[PDB]
Enzyme design. Sequence first.
Site, PDB file in Angstrom:
ATOM      1  CG  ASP A 171      -1.848   1.160   1.319  1.00  8.91           C
ATOM      2  OD1 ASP A 171      -1.744   2.121   0.524  1.00  8.91           O
ATOM      3  OD2 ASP A 171      -2.720   1.119   2.222  1.00  8.91           O
ATOM      4  CG  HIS A 202      -5.576   1.990   0.270  1.00 11.20           C
ATOM      5  ND1 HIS A 202      -5.056   2.326   1.502  1.00 11.20           N
ATOM      6  CD2 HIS A 202      -6.758   2.642   0.158  1.00 11.20           C
ATOM      7  CE1 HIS A 202      -5.889   3.172   2.104  1.00 11.20           C
ATOM      8  NE2 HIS A 202      -6.931   3.378   1.310  1.00 11.20           N
TER       9      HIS A 202
END
Length: 233
Positions: A171, A202
């Site tokens: 992420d 994410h």
Amino acid sequence: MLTEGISIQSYDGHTFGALVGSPAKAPAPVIVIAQEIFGVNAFMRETVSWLVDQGYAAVCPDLYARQAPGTALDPQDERQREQAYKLWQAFDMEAGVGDLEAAIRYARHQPYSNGKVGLVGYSLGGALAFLVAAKGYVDRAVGYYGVGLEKQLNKVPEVKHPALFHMGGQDHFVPAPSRQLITEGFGANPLLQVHWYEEAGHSFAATSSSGYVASAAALANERTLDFLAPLQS
């Protein structure tokens, strides 16, 4: 989408709606869900469903009601994603924590409440989960891929109830230097747990996201449910 008729009032007087799900067996612990940047949308509806099916009641407050009540944006629509980023940039984080504090209080005494309340937040909501955990408003807090936690590390000693965080190792809102800061900083308080999912980025727990990773969402979700189970009667 919100549940018609449901209204919660914040300390400063502002009122807002929420999407509510009651389980068949109550009373039950209630989970306040802190939204992503798209408002109370299909993924929030899905999160309410998931929790109700696991035997919790769930309350997802309209955190964007101070800006534009009832916002529910489709993340697959480019124009609506642009709107989501605009609302996020204008979002008052402190007012958000306060509205979640109000939703947590509300969740303590509904007909279906057993008096225990947890909080589960995603992305913007994951950052808010940490801030709420530092205030001590909930029994247990969970944050999935909260953004900017490496800037709130001075709050680690303030956390006095358990808080669990699931972070993606790919992420890029949390690059290596940020992951190191968070890992070292949260490491100082045993009430905090942070797991890194090395093959996920994410939005990994949202089945409609291009970032969805089934194995990481499943491991994180089971950890979340095991972490919340003590709130059950």
